[PDB]
């Protein structure tokens, strides 16, 4: 049999997803490299978790931007966990989305390593514990921090109206860089399991590596219960709503005229065909077509 195009992928966005994590996370590292490069007190400039983390939330935005506001952190698995909600029978596109992005961050770090050929991996954000929360300690820290990530996504897709100011991608991200600000530094463990895993493939550990996966899943999953009431598996619509307030309209009418001046009733022709001649009716009143 012929063998040239193996796999052939499933969708043009399965790729979008690994693609997503490599673009944000790879460079994200760059911020963590300078915050430490030049290393040691040599100048007055100082880099804090605020700069690098703030750096992280924005990229996500473009992640959204390079495609359109209609896309969230396709580069994040923590946010995707909430998306699941409660659907998983036998393999799903998301099953494919989680694996693809997990892959996005991992490949990203691999390429960045060569970059460290000249420098020293002292604070690449990989297995570099930060004074404060050990990795585990991020369990509480990851749940709140990450949770914040998921809630922004659901409300972003919500049609209701309550809090709106700009574009959802920009807003959810405000949530991301920040989210990173509390969670990432406390442990160095990402808000999302993707940030922690990209670096995690490099240096493996014990249960410490597991904490990275659970804290974000607990927080987001919980987010769902927090904002997900009224269940309605597949909108079947019994018979257009189930109540009335003002008779007259059936679909969506604001007025209730009574046929006073029929303007358009008989299709003059519907989609021209040829014509070749107009009514003419003479042109005694030439007011149209002037342009000086």
Curated annotation (Swiss-Prot):
Any one biological process term the GO annotation gives: transepithelial water transport
Regulation of its activity: The water channel activity is inhibited by P-choloromercuribenzene sulphonate and diethylpyrocarbonate(DPPC). The glycerol channel activity is inhibited by P-choloromercuribenzene sulphonate, diethylpyrocarbonate(DPPC), phloretin and Cu(2+). Inhibited by mercury.
Keyword set includes Glycoprotein: yes
Outcome (variant: residue 45 to V): In Co(A-B+) antigen
Motif (NPA 1): 76-78
Keyword Nuclease (UniProt): no
Residue numbers carrying Phosphoserine: 247, 262
Short motif NPA 2, span: 192-194
SUPFAM superfamilies: Aquaporin-like
Variant or mutagenesis effect after changing residue 189 to S: No effect on water channel activity
Segments in the Cytoplasmic topological domain: 2-11, 66-68, 83-90, 154-163, 225-269
Highest taxon, organism lineage: Eukaryota
Alphabetic keyword roster: Blood group antigen, Cell membrane, Glycoprotein, Membrane, Phosphoprotein, Repeat, Transmembrane, Transmembrane helix, Transport
Intramembrane segments: 69-82, 187-199
Residues bearing carbohydrate: 42, 205
One Gene Ontology term of the molecular function aspect: water transmembrane transporter activity
Role this protein plays: Forms a water channel that facilitates the transport of water across cell membranes, playing a crucial role in water homeostasis in various tissues. Could also be permeable to small solutes including hydrogen peroxide, glycerol and gases such as amonnia (NH3), nitric oxide (NO) and carbon dioxide (CO2). Recruited to the ankyrin-1 complex, a multiprotein complex of the erythrocyte membrane, it could be part of a CO2 metabolon, linking facilitated diffusion of CO2 across the membrane, anion exchange of Cl(-)/HCO3(-) and interconversion of dissolved CO2 and carbonic acid in the cytosol.
Domain notes: Aquaporins contain two tandem repeats each containing three membrane-spanning domains and a pore-forming loop with the signature motif Asn-Pro-Ala (NPA).
Record family assignment: Belongs to the MIP/aquaporin (TC 1.A.8) family.
Subunit structure and binding partners: Homotetramer; each monomer provides an independent water pore. Component of the ankyrin-1 complex in the erythrocyte, composed of ANK1, RHCE, RHAG, SLC4A1, EPB42, GYPA, GYPB and AQP1. Interacts with EPHB2; involved in endolymph production in the inner ear. Identified in a complex with STOM. Interacts (via the N-terminal) with ANK1 (via ANK 1-5 repeats). Interacts (via the C-terminal) with EPB42.
Name of the protein this chain belongs to: Aquaporin-1
Organism, scientific name: Homo sapiens (Human)
């Amino acid at each position: 049999m012929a063998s040239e195009f193996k796999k052939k992928l499933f969708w043009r966005a399965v790729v979008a997803e690994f693609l997503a994590t490599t673009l944000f996370v790879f460079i994200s590292i760059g911020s963590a490299l300078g915050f430490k490069y030049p290393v040691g007190n040599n100048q007055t400039a100082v880099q804090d978790n605020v700069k690098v983390s703030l750096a992280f939330g924005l990229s996500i935005a473009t992640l959204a931007q390079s495609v359109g506001h209609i896309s969230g952190a396709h580069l994040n698995p923590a946010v995707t966990l909430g998306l699941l909600l409660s659907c998983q029978i036998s393999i799903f596109r998301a099953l494919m989305y989680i694996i693809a992005q997990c892959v996005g961050a991992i490949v990203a770090t691999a390429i960045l390593s060569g970059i460290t050929s000249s420098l020293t991996g002292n604070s690449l954000g990989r297995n570099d514990l930060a004074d404060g929360v050990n990795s585990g300690q991020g369990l509480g820290i990851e749940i709140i921090g990450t949770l914040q990530l998921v809630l922004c996504v659901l409300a972003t897709t919500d049609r209701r109206r309550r809090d709106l100011g700009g574009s959802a991608p920009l807003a959810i991200g405000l949530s991301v860089a920040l989210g990173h600000l509390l969670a990432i530094d406390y442990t160095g463990c990402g808000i999302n399991p993707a940030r922690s895993f990209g670096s995690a493939v490099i240096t493996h550990n014990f249960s410490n590596h597991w904490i990275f996966w659970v804290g974000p899943f607990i927080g987001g999953a919980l987010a769902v219960l927090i904002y997900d009431f009224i269940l309605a598996p597949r909108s079947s619509d019994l018979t257009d709503r189930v109540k009335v307030w003002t008779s007259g309209q059936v679909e969506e009418y604001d007025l209730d005229a009574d046929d006073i001046n029929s303007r358009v009733e008989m299709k003059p022709k519907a989609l021209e065909q040829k014509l070749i001649s107009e009514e003419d009716l003479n042109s005694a009143v030439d007011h149209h077509h002037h342009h000086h």
